Ligand SMILES: Cn1cc(-c2ccccc2)nc1/C=C/c1cccc(N2CCOCC2)n1
Ligand SMILES: [Mg+2]
């Protein structure tokens with residue numbers, strides 16, 4: 001009951017900043033997540049015995065892939081922790097409970113391949129889920145783990161609170177499908193600008209939580225340049241692997257996934273910052289002003305890619 005998690009001083013301070021990197025010590029990641037739940041939600045939100053069992057089963061169902069791994073799950077949950085802590089009073093008790101879990105679970109049993117690769121390969125999951133294929137799978141794996149004996153961290157929610165929380169987690173996980181991001185942000189843009197944005201409107205909250213999910217999922221672009229750059233190598237290691245598998249099925253992959261076209265990575269990151277990242281954190285900053293540091297860090301990293309291209313690194 002009175003058993004707090006405490007971190008060393010540097011982590012205890014830096015974990016509160018948007019740009020915190022959880023470090024290379026894997027055995028500290030579970031404790032970092034519990035720390036964030038206890039301050040985001042309270043020491044009462046979950047039974048520690050059950051949360052600890054849930055965390056370790058979720059860890060087990062992330063694979064040893066270069067990018068879409070247990071480290072990303074925890075990184076994405078920390079960005080959400082930063083947003084919730086900088087926006088205390090905008091979020092219900094159930095929302096704070098659901099979103100940290102949604103973030104930890106959002107990429108469960110990822111194999112390092114896109115929805116396109118599953119469809120061109122004709123993977124069973126592409127027949128079971130025609131759109132947001134991996135994301136429907138990740139939500140499904142979440143429900144599985146929640147139903148293992150001793151793993152129901154929501155046991156003490158009422159029947160109806162329970163259904164609300166699994167509904168928050170479902171929409172939050174589905175929204176991590178970047179194919180859905182573009183129109184979600186366009187609608188959030190029109191609503192903010194025409195002044196129709198209304199946080200008491202459930203379908204509006206849903207959109208805003210969805211943009212938060214894209215923001216946390218993409219938060220590698222909001223770290224210190226050396227974290228941003230080194231993470232870019234991990235994400236390209238998956239893409240180039242998928243490119244290799246595209247060629248094995250007899251399909252020229254897009255340049256993004258073609259390891260022969262590595263030269264063009266700096267320009268490809270530029271397009272991505274301009275077309276996805278900057279717009280994402282811009283609309284998030286307009287809706288939730290305290291998330292401006294994510295926009296500011298993203299702009300700094302855009303400038304760092306501009307320098308790579310100009311031969312200054
Ligand atoms: C859109 N595009 C095009 C190219 C490219 C590269 C080389 C040759 C030709 C084209 N490359 C990107 C970018 C990919 C990409 C996609 C999703 C996330 C992400 N980041 C980087 C690391 O941390 C989190 C988000 N980057
Ligand atoms: Mg994903």
Ligand SMILES: [Zn+2]
Pocket residue numbers: 072076106107176217
């Ligand atoms: Zn992800």
